[PDB]
Amino acid sequence: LSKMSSLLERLHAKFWSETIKLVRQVMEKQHLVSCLETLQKALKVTSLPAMTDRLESIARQNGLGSHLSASGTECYITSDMFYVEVHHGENPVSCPELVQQLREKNFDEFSKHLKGLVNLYNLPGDNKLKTKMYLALQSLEQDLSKMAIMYWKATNAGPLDKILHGSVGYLTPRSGGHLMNLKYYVSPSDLLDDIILHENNVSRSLGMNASVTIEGTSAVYKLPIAPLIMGSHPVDNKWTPSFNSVDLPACFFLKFPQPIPVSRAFVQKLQNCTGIPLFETQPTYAPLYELITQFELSKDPDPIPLNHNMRFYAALPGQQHCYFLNKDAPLPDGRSLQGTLVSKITFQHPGRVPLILNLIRHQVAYNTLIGSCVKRTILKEDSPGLLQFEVCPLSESRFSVSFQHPVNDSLVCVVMDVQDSTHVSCKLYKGLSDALICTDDFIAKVVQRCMSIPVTMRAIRRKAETI
């Protein structure tokens, strides 16, 4: 449309040397040109100074200072982040991640790495403390490394045990802009794909993660600037006490990529274990089952909201299931299970990080058991089957799945309590005059092998119907 009048004015131009002479006279006499250049870096052909130009464009894009010394060597330069492609330290590592991205045509991941390296050193201090602040992170990282190695000294456990129940976790050290990732949990479903063997080339995203970092806060805290574990209790870790240290206006963080919904009693348990307040302002509490459903539905997004009204449907092989997750059922205190989304847990010194993680592992395990109901499969109002189930919270870390007896007509309620990360105990609750359905250890076996409600309910139904 506008191109037609553009071609008409172009026909008027046919009816430019004077324009070049005008540009020359102005030469004898900003943002737009560089913006067009940064759009057009996509269309540059592969060549050595052109790739230097596109890397300079990445530098201008993420706010960093480019400097070439040749067509080979180009430096990205800011107050501490200084590295080349061919402050206060060497250029440490020829890291294969950045080189592997740049040897291919993967410049956006290079941009993400420079974004992460900006967000590491964007701390508010006058730059001197910044160095010391980064040093504190280094000390923390070293301590964290030792603890995982201490666990590898303790037992020669596989990576799965290192994830599920060990100290720290599967620990990927930092490399470029990617900060240090602890994998504290991987579910029995998310372990499997479409039956994964878990050998030490395990994926970064294969589970639930938490990245450790430093961040400037509004308060002042005392953090170590030295590797705090010089002496190690041979099966534990043991920390020499503080001061060294200095009172940086910052704190260590465990940032989760996807915010975890946690209950109120979790908030008090973690503020007891840490000592530092978690929610600086008090947030707006919500029922946990809303947050669990928003978490599980916002895993795989679609533009249509499900409009569930807490009545989820499950299409299974030899069965069809319905679930009522039943928020606002009152606890013994008289209130529903109220929780909020946590994303950043602040700790001061690294000895807290196993205990903190055990708490989060507990919480994440509980969410997976309530995560298995939240599905998008709509087998709406099918007259065959639709075994109508209910989930209610009797307490923190306990819940109950209530459902019709497969033989008789009284209710049967299976109460599940999540003791630890991989241990959930189960009790069948039955009328005094009913049929034998299952033993509790069978329910514990199916739960710990699958970590999903509907699979255990089908196991209950099938082992009832064989008898």
Binding site: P188, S189, L192, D194, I195, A314, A315, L316, P317, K375, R376, T377, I378, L379, F442, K445, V446, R449, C450, S452, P454, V455, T456, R458, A459
Partner: peptide, 20 residues
């Protein structure tokens, strides 16, 4: 919709194998 989720189907197979 009206389809067993593939991941759920795999978990069902694993559960059936356990305890014969």
């Amino acid at each position: 919709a009206a389809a067993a989720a593939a991941a759920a189907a795999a978990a069902a197979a694993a559960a059936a194998a356990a305890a014969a």
